[PDB]
């Protein structure tokens, strides 16, 4: 026989979208006590997860999305680097395994500034993406980079969020490489920012379109697949505005269902890409069928 290997394959998933190349990049996974963070009784979460053959704590993917439009290379979210423990921070290595170098990234779009999305921006004291311009909504940057907000943060978890956002973005701000937008904004050709505020004050969805094929990168608009597709009204204590996140999630799901296009989200099971159909009181996520990509 042979010794066991016990390693996972490189965490990248390639998919074509019209003339664009999408690469989902895994940052790793982390076990989350979702039954304690969701705004509903723990037994109800347990029953939902059991319907999906799952149990809390739940191993949850953390994913960023690389878009090569053919003229620009854009990275949507960057993982956690070392901010959330040793099971995360795989995204840079998976970017390299996917055939790219960090120096090649032209722009980085942040759905929001929670540590598991901004941590990858820094390797120690060095910019992880030395040529990239970072973009996020002005509301997001104004909230998370505020010293006064950090000084008035209620608990250690929130303080750590502020500190991580500052440590990750401020070096780019200082280098002149942070370029905010406000609300719905055309970014590089083929990618648009769609305001989806409420998980954080400036949470933004990024819509990628090429040759009639559309993909909405929803960020953290959904967090627990086995709960929030069936019941989109369930929120978490990590959402800044629970009512707004429910409204925005329902809007995104309704639009994806009506349009029949792809969505992706950072914490859907990797690669986190699929279609949505409206069913009953909520929605059914349909993960994309495994497809091989070959050179053109």
Q: From the list 84, 100, 162, 178, which residue makes contact with its own copies (rule: CB under 8 A)?
A: 100
Kindly state the smallest distance separating residue 241's Cβ from its own copies, in Å.
29
**What token pair was written down for 158?**
């929130």
Closer CB to Zn ion, 107 or 220, in the complex: 220
Kindly state the smallest distance separating residue 21's Cβ from its own copies, in Å.
4
Size of the chain in residues = 296
DSSP state of 30: E
Q: From the list 72, 96, 163, 192, which residue makes contact with its own copies (rule: CB under 8 A)?
A: 72
Question: Which three-class secondary structure state does DSSP give residue 42?
Answer: helix
At residue 239, what are phi and psi to the nearest 5 degrees? -80, 130
Q: From the list 90, 114, 135, 197, which residue makes contact with Zn ion (rule: CB under 5 A)?
A: 114
At residue 42, what are phi and psi to the nearest 5 degrees? -55, -40
Total interface residues for its own copies by CB under 8 A? 55
For its own copies, the binding residues in 6-35 under the rule CB under 8 A are 6-14, 16, 21, 23, 26, 28-29
> Which residue intervals of 98-241 are DSSP H helices?
115-118, 138-144, 147-151, 156-174, 225-228
- Whether residue 116 is annotated as binding a ligand: the answer is yes
Closer CB to its own copies, 1 or 151, in the complex: 1
Asked if 104 is part of the footprint of its own copies (rule: CB under 8 A), the reply reads: yes
Asked if 126 is part of the footprint of its own copies (rule: CB under 8 A), the reply reads: no
Q: From the list 45, 68, 235, 236, which residue makes contact with its own copies (rule: CB under 8 A)?
A: 68
| Sheet containing 20-32, strands listed edge to edge, beginning at the edge strand earlier in sequence | 12-17, 20-32, 58-68, 73-76, 107-109, 133-135
- Residue 296 interacts, among Zn ion, its own copies, none and using kind-specific CB cut-offs from 5 to 8 Å, with its own copies
Rounded distance between C-alpha atoms, residue 163 and residue 155, angstroms: 12
Closer CB to its own copies, 19 or 186, in the complex: 19
Q: From the list 140, 220, 239, 248, which residue makes contact with Zn ion (rule: CB under 5 A)?
A: 220
Asked if 259 is part of the footprint of its own copies (rule: CB under 8 A), the reply reads: no
- Whether residue 151 is annotated as binding a ligand: the answer is no
H-run or E-run covering 57: none
Pairing of strands 191-195, 282-287: unpaired
Asked if 200 contacts 242 with a C-beta cutoff of 8 angstroms, the reply is no
- Whether residue 112 is annotated as binding a ligand: the answer is yes
> Which residue intervals of the chain are DSSP H helices?
34-37, 42-51, 91-97, 115-118, 138-144, 147-151, 156-174, 225-228, 242-259
Closer CB to its own copies, 132 or 165, in the complex: 132
Question: Where does the chain show beta strands of DSSP type E?
Answer: 12-17, 20-32, 58-68, 73-76, 107-109, 122-123, 126-127, 133-135, 185-186, 191-195, 204-210, 213-217, 262-264, 273-279, 282-287
Asked if 147 is part of the footprint of its own copies (rule: CB under 8 A), the reply reads: no
Residues that constitute the known binding site for Zn(2+): 112, 114, 116-117, 199, 220, 267
Residue numbers of the site for its own copies (CB under 8 A)?
Answer: 1-2, 4-14, 16, 21, 23, 26, 28-29, 51-54, 58-59, 61, 68-73, 87, 97-101, 104, 106, 260, 269-270, 275, 277, 286-287, 289-296
Q: Which residues bind Zn ion (CB under 5 A)?
A: 114, 116, 220
């Amino acid at each position: 026989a042979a010794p066991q290997v016990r390693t996972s394959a490189p965490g990248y998933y390639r998919m074509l979208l019209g003339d664009f190349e999408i690469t989902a990049l895994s940052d790793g996974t982390v076990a989350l006590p979702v039954d304690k963070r969701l705004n509903q009784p723990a037994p109800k979460t347990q029953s939902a997860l059991a319907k999906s053959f799952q149990k809390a704590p739940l191993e949850t993917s953390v994913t960023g999305y690389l878009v090569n439009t053919g003229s620009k290379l854009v990275l949507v979210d960057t993982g956690a680097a070392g901010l959330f423990g040793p099971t995360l921070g795989r995204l840079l290595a998976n970017l390299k395994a996917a055939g790219y170098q960090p120096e090649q990234v032209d722009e980085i779009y942040l759905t929001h500034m929670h540590p598991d999305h901004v941590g990858g921006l820094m390797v120690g004291e060095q910019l992880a993406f030395p040529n990239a311009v970072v973009r996020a909504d002005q509301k997001e940057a104004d909230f998370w980079l505020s010293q006064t907000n950090l000084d008035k943060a209620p608990d250690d978890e929130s303080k750590g969020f502020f500190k991580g956002a500052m440590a990750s973005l401020n070096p780019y701000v200082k280098a002149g490489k942070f370029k905010p937008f406000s609300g719905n904004t055309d970014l590089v050709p083929g990618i648009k920012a769609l305001a989806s505020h409420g998980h954080t004050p400036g949470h933004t969805t990024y819509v990628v379109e090429s040759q009639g094929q559309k993909l909405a990168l929803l960020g953290d608009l959904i967090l627990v697949a086995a709960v929030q597709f069936d019941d989109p009204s369930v929120t978490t204590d990590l959402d800044s505005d629970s009512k707004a996140v429910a409204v925005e999630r329902k809007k995104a799901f309704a639009d994806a269902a009506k349009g029949g296009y792809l969505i992706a989200a950072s914490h859907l099971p990797f690669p986190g890409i699929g279609h949505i159909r409206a069913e009953g009181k909520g929605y059914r996520f349909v993960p994309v069928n495994y497809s091989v990509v070959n050179a053109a």
